[PDB]
Design a protein around this ligand. Sequence first.
Ligand SMILES: COc1ccccc1CNc1ccc(C(N)=O)cn1
Ligand SMILES: COc1ccccc1CNc1ccc(C(N)=O)cn1
Lengths: 237, 237
Amino acid sequence: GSHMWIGVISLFPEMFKAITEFGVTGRAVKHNLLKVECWNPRDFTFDKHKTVDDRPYGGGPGMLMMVQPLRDAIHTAKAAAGEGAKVIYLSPQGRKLDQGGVTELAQNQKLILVCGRYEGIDERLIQTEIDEEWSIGDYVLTGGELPAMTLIDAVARFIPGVLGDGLLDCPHYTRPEVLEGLTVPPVLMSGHHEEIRKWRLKQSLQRTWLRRPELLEGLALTDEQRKLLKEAQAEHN
Amino acid sequence: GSHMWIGVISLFPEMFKAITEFGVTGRAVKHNLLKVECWNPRDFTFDKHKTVDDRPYGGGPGMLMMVQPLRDAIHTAKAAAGEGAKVIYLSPQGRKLDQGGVTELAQNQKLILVCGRYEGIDERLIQTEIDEEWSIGDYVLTGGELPAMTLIDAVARFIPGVLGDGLLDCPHYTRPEVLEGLTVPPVLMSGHHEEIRKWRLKQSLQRTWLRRPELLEGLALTDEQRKLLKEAQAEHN
Ligand SMILES: COc1ccccc1CNc1ccc(C(N)=O)cn1
Ligand SMILES: COc1ccccc1CNc1ccc(C(N)=O)cn1
């Protein structure tokens, strides 16, 4: 159906086995709903030692990705992708990823994800080769590979066939009925589907209010949600 | 020195090869600065088919992790960890991870990371077994493994020997001197270390202001930073 092709530029393509070989994403790859293809800048070097890093102009402690191997790898991935592929660079300086941003990225049938190492890539390559710069969160990692895999996993959930409202999820319970003295809320045993739906929605509203109140500010609550939230806040007091 | 031990509870322990076998984190593991030990709930099942999921009370589309295998795996990891280990559950409902939160978590010499699959774990296990619940970002994934690896990588950077201010990083440049007509800022060639430091700081301030203005609100800028930021905003106008 709406399959997705993701090209990856990475010095450590074997890291991507974590998503291509296991779980829901591994099944998506096996079933051809998701295709992940990697190019390694090390394969585009020409010197004896296959050098992939370079020193920044102006000095400093860190290194950058060497331009020539990385640029050639990107160009090769773009040629394999054809037209319509969006090239994404993962960095702390990028647009912060959220579920809304995931749904936007999932609209692309083709993506190329550039995984920086060291202190990242040359600023001019961002200008000449990168369409969009994204961050998975306000923290620093040793490479863009984990952010790239996180993005792949999140967008894969929107591909039809891969899987089997602004609020945090409600609590969930399974067997057994009592666990270290803690019982399951009786409503979940009642079999009354409408009471269960309202209980879960009310719990999601209460949990969002208590834990992430700023998420509620970005929402236009329905009539039902306004009432259940008021009830939850009244019981809390 | 300040080595770190991280126990992991996961149905897919082989995903963690992505951090234990490659790059800076793989070296940290090889050098015994970081130890990652995994327990798989599937090994704690007793039925013929090694069942690790269970149905939620109250119905619904999703499944939960089965309590008994997961609980036994957690208890085994806690016994291997000894005293002082903090047990962390990765979920979208958790505290949002940022670099400040990474530095807090890195203060622990021992961590146990519980990786949920399906719709997560029973709420009572969070109450009885989990010390802290964290999220790597406001998006949903197919498992907690990628969040757990992201956390491991971020905290590993604070372990002394693993590697070789609230603002986004400045642009960086490497060879060649001209790339598709784009030149390197002459100051970075000048060799004047003080001018380079001020240029980079000014660029970091300008970039944070243009891209993530809310990050500036949480900062008490130094005298030098206030001046360079004013200069950047004046040149922008
Ligand atoms: C200092 O490292 C870099 C510097 C610049 C670019 C890439 C890297 C690689 N590391 C990353 C990558 C992405 C994210 C994120 N928040 O999306 C976090 N870390
Ligand atoms: C619906 O999935 C779950 C539901 C509940 C718990 C765990 C999972 C596993 N998936 C995750 C895990 C963590 C994060 C995060 N933002 O840290 C995102 N997704």
